[PDB]
Structures are given as structure tokens and as C-alpha cells.
Amino acid sequence: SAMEDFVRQCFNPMIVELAEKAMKEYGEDPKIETNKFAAICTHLEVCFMYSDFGKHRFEIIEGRDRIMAWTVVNSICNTTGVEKPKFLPDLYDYKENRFIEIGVTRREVHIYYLEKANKIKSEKTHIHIFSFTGEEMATKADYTLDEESRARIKTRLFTIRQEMASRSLWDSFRQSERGE
Ligand SMILES: CONC(=O)c1[nH]c(Br)cc(=O)c1O
Ligand SMILES: [Mn+2]
Ligand SMILES: [Mn+2]
């Protein structure tokens, strides 16, 4: 498939390694579930771009094995007092002192927003949704990052989108709702 080839073409090795690991945690083959392969990679990259942009302001919980992810969640909760999320989130924002759930969607942002929000049902985890179209939605329209940092995520997402479309892989990808 050209999709696996493109995943290994545009995503640096670190992310692809982690993506295959998270794909085995579902008995899943990235050579078959390749749209999930790419979505997992893209999301991972968004989380990593977000953390680095914010003296470290964000703690990455995404990309950890579940033992260490929940260990970091628990350490944060016990030293700040934030409420234990029911589900593992993506970042902790030490500045606003909240958990952030990063959403990357091929659908409208408002829709995947309502989806994550209705799933988490704890208005104490901040949601920030990014599309491949330079659109973003976010709890209380608080976007956390400076405008520039968000420019950078949106440019990267739109670049994956155009690079998939130059390979004739974007119609398949947007017409899939896995990785979401
Ligand atoms: C293994 O834990 N799963 C996740 O963290 C996760 N899954 C999906 Br689908 C979309 C996300 O945005 C996300 O953060
Ligand atoms: Mn996550
Ligand atoms: Mn997420």
C-alpha cells in the first residue's frame, strides 16, 4: 500500500515506532489498518508539537504506555489537586492547570468536538480540536497556545493532507473515521 509507504515517508521514525506499538495494543496490523496507522501518527505529532510549543508548560501523557501515562496523570493530580480524569488525556497544561484532550479530525470541528465532549462528560478536561483545513474548535474558545504555535500545527496538518492528496490517498483518508 502507498499509505504505509507515505506514513514512513513523512513521519519521523520516533512517531512511527510508537504508532505501531499502539496498533499492536488492539491486535491490529498497520499494513491493513493503514488509515488508522496515519491517523495515529498525525495525532501523535500534533500532541508533540503542542507540548513543545508551550519552563515546560505541558506534560505529554499521549505516547506513553498505559502504566506510565496513568503514573504521570496520578503524580499531577496529587501535586496540583486536579480531579482524576476518567480517560487518559493527551497533555497537562501546568499554566492553566488543566488536562487537554487533543482532537484531530477529518470531519467538521464542531462535530468531532461534540463527539469528544459527549464522550468525556467532565468539563474539567479542555478540548482542542484541529482539522486538516486550518479550522480549530476548543472548550470555551480558549485555544491555550499563542496564535503562532497554532499556525504551526495547522500548517503541519494541511501539509499531511496535501501530501496524501498528491498521492491520491486523501479521499480514502477523509472518508475514514478511524484514528478518530
Ligand atoms: C490509547 O489511548 N487512546 C487515545 O489517547 C486517543 N484515541 C483516539 Br481514536 C483519538 C484521540 O484523540 C486520542 O487521544
Ligand atoms: Mn490520547
Ligand atoms: Mn486525543
Which residue from 37, 49, 54, 5 is spatially nearest to 157, judged by alpha carbons? 49
Experimental technique of record: X-ray
Q: Is the dihedral of CA 95, 99, 104, 107 positive or negative?
A: negative
What value does the CA radius of gyration of the chain take, rounded to a whole number of Å? 16
First-last CA distance in the chain? 21
Range 43-46, long-range pairs (CB < 8 A, 24+ positions): 43/102, 43/104, 43/179, 44/15, 44/18, 44/19, 45/11, 45/15, 45/156, 46/102, 46/104, 46/130, 46/153, 46/156, 46/157
Beta bridge partners of 129: 103, 137
Atom 9 of ligand 1: nearest residue by CA position: 180
Our count of domains for the chain comes to 1
Q: How far apart are CA 53 and CA 45, in angstroms?
A: 12
Residue identified by cell 479542555 is 126
CA contacts within 13 A on the Cβ side of 42? 32
Atom 10 of ligand 1: nearest residue by CA position: 180
Residue identified by cell 503542542 is 50
Range of the domain at 154: 1-180
Q: How far apart are CA 117 and CA 122, in angstroms?
A: 8
DSSP 28: -
Q: Copy the grid coordinates of residue 109.
A: 470541528
- CB proximity list for 133: less than 8 A, separation 6 or greater: 158, 161
Does the beta carbon of 90 lie inside 6 Å of ligand 1? yes
Index of the ligand 1 atom closest to the CA of residue 22: 1
